[PDB]
Design a protein around this ligand. Structure first.
Ligand code: NAP
Ligand code: NAP
Ligand code: NAP
Ligand code: NAP
Ligand code: Q0K
Ligand code: Q0K
Ligand code: Q0K
Ligand code: Q0K
Lengths: 251, 250, 250, 251
């Protein structure tokens, strides 16, 4: 019987690439999304056309609130409801925007969205994943290769991603006895933002030593599939940079 | 006249030591506290008896919530209302207890542990910076053991990791204003009052330098250095004060 | 036609498993060795029996000395002599023993520990680069415990740190030629051959993931990944393969 | 009576500032140098004119060789010969130049860059510890804040400074039971090379978040003085960046 994976924010871009590559490898998938309903359903349609009854969608806001634990518990539940098991969790969903320290959304909302999606939701999903559990169980957290050389005015986002590194490490430690491995993949510049202009995209491209280009979504996904695979059976607590050398380059 | 500092969680233990040492250096201080009202007020008395009009208290819960931004703004304000300036911020207040992955609801655990260790420091940093030769700086109390965390302390460790990110991000962003941002990372210091000596001693034996915990004063020494004129080029730095504990393999 | 790889210290244990998996994946291999001539020869014989003339041996001392650059150049030359190309370099050979601060001379200890773990990797990297659809890469066998080192292993640990520096510096510098440079960092793998099981168990008990040492094959799996087409954007990265060992506090 | 310190490469620049501040603090000092004899002697004259019999010079090449252990032992011995004790060792001397991967031989590059930056510090540390067989004994290694974002084509120099981090950690661990603390100070840009032109200096200056300028030698020295002081008695294995935020800056 085929294993199953939850991928958060899987409707587009890197999350979709991850869900697609897991599915190609044999997995049944829960494609979680927040606002991108059409794209999520369109992906599940494609995957199910390849293998019937192997993809479902699951909608949730991963902003921090007092109900976030329930929402995270329900995402995991949806995987057991559809597929009878949950082998893999990939924490990919993420809010990303500037939050300058010195002077739209209130700061309360900024905290809730940036820390919720990048850190607290991954924590709650990890709790729920673990509580529901031979086989090959693991979690992969999408981290950021540039956490120690952050973008200017992205403190909350950066705090969130640092917290995600602590979760990766703390959860690797605590869940090791249950056979659940916990690891990360840390992109540098991969698929650039949709709203970014081509000139600014090129400025970022020229900073990458290996090939002067951004990582493809498939390149990020490749690292994810390695860590979930049997070829990574002794690996836990590890974060693999997939950044083409970007984090090595001084100002 | 004399510079002013806010120290969060300053009524006892390390925060008290820090407040006292800053006061001894010539600072006026805002003693923030949450539940330890008697100790805070008694500390303010002692400091004011030493030098008049150099200490006040400010109570606040630093648990994350929709009112935390206001609370943090008011802590910073209390320094300007009392002293007319705010030169140093020390983010010391911290919740610490296990939150296993398998009485408090989990959402309360999140709020307390991520609030006190990370979000409150961010919000105080915002308010500090907005309200601004001078020697302005922030010192965050981090943890030397963040990469080898205590078992079942996920949320606490996430909080201290986020604090490292804030230290770096704020160092970068506030550098144009001359505000330095740094950390001090204890290993074992003091030990919990509720811990029995037998368990205390197991920890002491782990420390290479002396087989003892740090005194609060030793932690405070590092904070004093970072706020001083002898650290004017230092920002984004985290100084371990751990007697080598983080270097010791399992 | 088939790509080719140099694996240093490939006659036994982890380096042997690396060479075997590389060969299994389709590479022709240079099995470098120092003392273990029978095992190296026997391995090349095994691999050549599988596929004709897909393995050769190359002996060299990788201790630092005035002849080390020439020896390293000749290792790379041996790959081109045998196979007409050199796609992959795996710096695996390593001396490992204590060098307390307080019957080899210290200058010999320096030469062996720093030479095998760092200088030879550098010299091999130079020679590999100078000699250059294409998937060119280097993988350095680092150490997950480099920041929590064994007591009295300062020169070894210095070597392994220098090897991290080389991994990063070379990733940057060689990126414009399409040569990727990465590492794999074991925690405990295999354990020493003569170590009593009761001592082995003390180490095993420390590993969170399964309370056991890694197999040689599990380390090799990571190397295969880094050399593969699935890692073609990965450079300057060091993958721990340690079962969580480096996360465990004292 | 007055404690004594050895500062390597102390005739000029940062090592000179260190020696001076140690002396202003009450230490007697061994001014080690290699080629800068006139400067070393001039500094010893200035210090002794301030307080007679409190400075000596000591010449040694710290290039790696089979006699490097003897040279390092003699440096420490010279402090004991002059002053009867050796309380502080500051490993400051350092060769620095490019060694690309693709007039000096490579064996000479290796010996100089790895010798000065790493092996000599190890040997000096050994000899310091062994001679210790009322006091605040410690070692301070001059590291580099940019070791993880290294200058292009500086691999041997970078390998040296990384080994120096490992030494700092390994020796802190091993020497702790003897009451000897071992720490580091990690500049980013300080002073700038004497060779460097005004335009190129300003280019580097502009990179620094805190003040858009290089650190003074005295600013580096301040941190060294802190680490040797009674205010750092629980600090060992710590490396303090003194870089004005430079290492936080992405490409
Ligand atoms: N792109 C890069 O260069 C890069 C660089 C460094 C790190 N990373 C990391 O790699 C991962 C993927 O990057 P990406 O660029 O593909 O991400 P992205 O497009 O920015 O975000 C992925 C998804 O996050 C979901 N999301 C955002 N806010 C949410 C909320 N409040 N609740 C629930 N879901 C929410 C969105 O779902 P809907 O669209 O369904 O609303 C979105 O599709 C992220 O974890 C990211 O931080 C990426
Ligand atoms: N002790 C150690 O060994 C050690 C080790 C590593 C890092 N550190 C760090 O060093 C710092 C000081 O350590 P410590 O042992 O002195 O701390 P602590 O005694 O655990 O706590 C310091 C203070 O934090 C305040 N606090 C807790 N929850 C709060 C809330 N919800 N809102 C506002 N304030 C709250 C408390 O104030 P009230 O008492 O007034 O309620 C408490 O006195 C902390 O940041 C800690 O994480 C300490
Ligand atoms: N095993 C572990 O738990 C562990 C942990 C952390 C890191 N690592 C790293 O993983 C790698 C492989 O580990 P391992 O345990 O398999 O290593 P090992 O058995 O200790 O050594 C590997 C080989 O290194 C070669 N070697 C030693 N001195 C040499 C010299 N002077 N010149 C040339 N070659 C020399 C030897 O070749 P001959 O036999 O032919 O003389 C030896 O078979 C090493 O880089 C190691 O540091 C291993
Ligand atoms: N300057 C910076 O921006 C910067 C940045 C990062 C790190 N650092 C570190 O801080 C320390 C001091 O920096 P710096 O710019 O002041 O250093 P420097 O001027 O480049 O070199 C310091 C001294 O090293 C000695 N030295 C060089 N080769 C030697 C050899 N073979 N044997 C013995 N001694 C030798 C020289 O002594 P003689 O003059 O007597 O020949 C020289 O005065 C160094 O460790 C450096 O790596 C500096
Ligand atoms: C140039 C450029 C633009 C964006 C990123 C980026 C980093 N982390 C992110 N997390 C989310 N969720 N989405 C993103 O787009 C990014 C990195 C470099
Ligand atoms: C044995 C032992 C006990 C406690 C600590 C400790 C770490 N971080 C902390 N943060 C707060 N706020 N309070 C604490 O007490 C601690 C570490 C080791
Ligand atoms: C108990 C125990 C024994 C050895 C190791 C070990 C670490 N690094 C090593 N490098 C080489 N070359 N050979 C080794 O054997 C080791 C780790 C733990
Ligand atoms: C622009 C610029 C120039 C030099 C440095 C520098 C780094 N590490 C060094 N070590 C020694 N010994 N001497 C140096 O001068 C430097 C850094 C930035």
């Amino acid at each position: 019987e085929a294993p199953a994976a939850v991928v958060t924010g899987a409707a587009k871009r890197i999350g979709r690439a991850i869900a697609v590559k897991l599915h190609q490898t044999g997995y049944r998938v829960v494609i979680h999304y927040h606002n991108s309903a059409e794209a999520a359903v369109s992906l599940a349609d494609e995957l199910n056309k390849e293998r019937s009854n192997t993809a479902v969608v699951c909608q949730a806001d991963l902003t921090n609130s007092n109900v976030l634990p329930a929402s995270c518990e329900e995402i995991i539940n949806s995987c057991f409801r559809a597929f009878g098991r949950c082998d893999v969790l990939v924490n990919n969903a993420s809010a990303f925007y500037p939050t300058p320290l010195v002077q739209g959304k209130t700061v309360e909302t900024q905290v809730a969205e940036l820390i919720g999606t990048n850190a607290i939701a991954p924590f709650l999903l990890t709790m729920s994943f673990a509580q529901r559990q031979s086989s090959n169980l693991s979690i992969v957290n999408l981290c950021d290769a540039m956490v120690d050389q952050p973008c200017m005015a992205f403190s909350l986002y950066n705090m969130g991603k640092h917290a995600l590194v602590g979760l990766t490490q703390s959860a690797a430690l605590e869940l090791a006895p249950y056979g659940i491995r916990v690891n990360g993949v840390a992109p540098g510049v991969s698929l650039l933002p949709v709203a970014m202009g081509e000139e600014e995209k090129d400025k970022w491209r020229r900073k990458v030593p290996l090939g002067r280009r951004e990582a493809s979504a498939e390149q990020i996904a490749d690292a994810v599939i390695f860590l979930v695979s049997g070829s990574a059976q002794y690996i836990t607590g590890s974060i693999i940079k997939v950044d083409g050398g970007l984090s090595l380059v001084h100002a």
